[PDB]
Design an enzyme around this catalytic site. Structure first.
Site, PDB file in Angstrom:
ATOM      1  CG  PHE A 112      -0.415  -0.140   2.734  1.00 15.93           C
ATOM      2  CD1 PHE A 112       0.097  -1.365   3.208  1.00 15.93           C
ATOM      3  CD2 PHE A 112      -0.291   0.968   3.197  1.00 15.93           C
ATOM      4  CE1 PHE A 112       0.475  -1.467   4.570  1.00 15.93           C
ATOM      5  CE2 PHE A 112       0.167   1.019   4.687  1.00 15.93           C
ATOM      6  CZ  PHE A 112       0.521  -0.341   4.976  1.00 15.93           C
ATOM      7  CG  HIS A 125       0.908  -3.265   7.677  1.00 17.78           C
ATOM      8  ND1 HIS A 125       0.608  -4.141   6.931  1.00 17.78           N
ATOM      9  CD2 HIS A 125       0.344  -3.280   8.834  1.00 17.78           C
ATOM     10  CE1 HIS A 125      -0.657  -4.516   7.329  1.00 17.78           C
ATOM     11  NE2 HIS A 125      -0.875  -3.860   8.401  1.00 17.78           N
TER      12      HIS A 125
HETATM   13  C1  LIG Z   1      -3.272  -1.003   5.019  1.00 20.50           C
HETATM   14  C2  LIG Z   1      -2.691  -2.561   4.824  1.00 20.50           C
HETATM   15  O1  LIG Z   1      -4.161  -3.423   4.882  1.00 20.50           O
HETATM   16  C3  LIG Z   1      -3.871  -4.765   5.043  1.00 20.50           C
HETATM   17  O2  LIG Z   1      -2.805  -5.195   4.791  1.00 20.50           O
HETATM   18  C4  LIG Z   1      -4.920  -5.772   5.162  1.00 20.50           C
HETATM   19  C5  LIG Z   1      -4.836  -5.818   6.949  1.00 20.50           C
HETATM   20  C6  LIG Z   1      -5.850  -6.636   7.571  1.00 20.50           C
HETATM   21  S1  LIG Z   1      -5.295  -6.987   9.414  1.00 20.50           S
HETATM   22  C7  LIG Z   1      -4.059  -8.360   9.339  1.00 20.50           C
HETATM   23  N1  LIG Z   1      -4.891  -6.897   4.666  1.00 20.50           N
HETATM   24  C8  LIG Z   1      -5.050  -7.332   3.324  1.00 20.50           C
HETATM   25  O3  LIG Z   1      -5.755  -6.184   2.737  1.00 20.50           O
HETATM   26  N2  LIG Z   1      -5.217  -8.396   2.837  1.00 20.50           N
HETATM   27  C9  LIG Z   1      -4.624  -9.570   3.347  1.00 20.50           C
HETATM   28  C10 LIG Z   1      -3.681 -10.009   2.637  1.00 20.50           C
HETATM   29  C11 LIG Z   1      -3.302 -11.285   2.265  1.00 20.50           C
HETATM   30  C12 LIG Z   1      -2.093 -12.099   1.711  1.00 20.50           C
HETATM   31  C13 LIG Z   1      -1.046 -11.062   1.778  1.00 20.50           C
HETATM   32  N3  LIG Z   1       0.259 -11.725   1.295  1.00 20.50           N
HETATM   33  C14 LIG Z   1      -1.061  -9.598   1.965  1.00 20.50           C
HETATM   34  C15 LIG Z   1      -2.080  -9.045   2.455  1.00 20.50           C
END
Ligand SMILES: CCOC(=O)[C@H](CCSC)NC(=O)NCc1ccc(N)cc1
Ligand SMILES: [K+]
Ligand SMILES: [K+]
Length: 164
Positions: A112, A125
């Site tokens: 992101f 992250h």
């Molecule tokens: C602002 C960033 O938001 C995220 O990353 C959210 C967070 C959900 S809380 C764990 N997760 C997501 O959108 N997607 C889940 C995900 C699945 C597999 C991988 N390799 C990466 C991400």
């Protein structure tokens, strides 16, 4: 030096412009290398032709799920997932480039670009870069999101690669 990479983005087939990103290989070499290689496509897969699938105004623009196009997939150049490299870099403001995840040690390809300071993600992250040029392009992408994250137009990385 640290890689400089680009994403050329369109919205329903109309070009929005280019986002240039610095990748902090000096701090997170393995995370930077993954993103770099996914931009060039040199491993035979990567970001070209994939979408920004989740875009939330006043938060962030999320992309890199080039397998499922919906935030459940993607994969890294190392395998499906790789560990959290470190949490040295912080989510300090708009333009930060950070790895999406589904919990600890689940980095793949999704990433992101922050449109605000997202400090509540610090230590959760992996931050690995920032926007050098094209924050106005990021704001255009942001304009097609919604509070739910759904986009009102199809936002596509039409080309990508490395500048230096
Ligand atoms: C602002 C960033 O938001 C995220 O990353 C959210 C967070 C959900 S809380 C764990 N997760 C997501 O959108 N997607 C889940 C995900 C699945 C597999 C991988 N390799 C990466 C991400
Ligand atoms: K919120
Ligand atoms: K669809």
């Amino acid at each position: 030096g640290n890689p400089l990479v680009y994403l050329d983005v369109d919205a329903n087939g109309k070009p929005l412009g280019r986002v240039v990103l610095e990748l902090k290989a000096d701090v997170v070499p393995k995370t930077a290398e993954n993103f770099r290689a996914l931009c060039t496509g040199e491993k035979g897969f990567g970001y070209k032709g994939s979408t920004f699938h989740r875009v939330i105004p006043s938060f962030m623009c999320q992309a890199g799920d080039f397998t499922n196009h919906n935030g459940t997939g993607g994969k890294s150049i190392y395998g499906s997932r790789f560990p959290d490299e470190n949490f040295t870099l912080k989510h300090v403001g708009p333009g930060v480039l950070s790895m999406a995840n589904a919990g600890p040690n689940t980095n793949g390809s999704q990433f992101f670009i922050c449109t605000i300071k997202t400090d509540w993600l610090d230590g959760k992250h992996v931050v690995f870069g920032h926007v050098i040029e094209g924050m106005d392009v990021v704001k255009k992408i942001e304009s097609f999101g919604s509070k739910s994250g759904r986009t009102s137009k199809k936002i596509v990385i039409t080309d990508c690669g490395q500048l230096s």
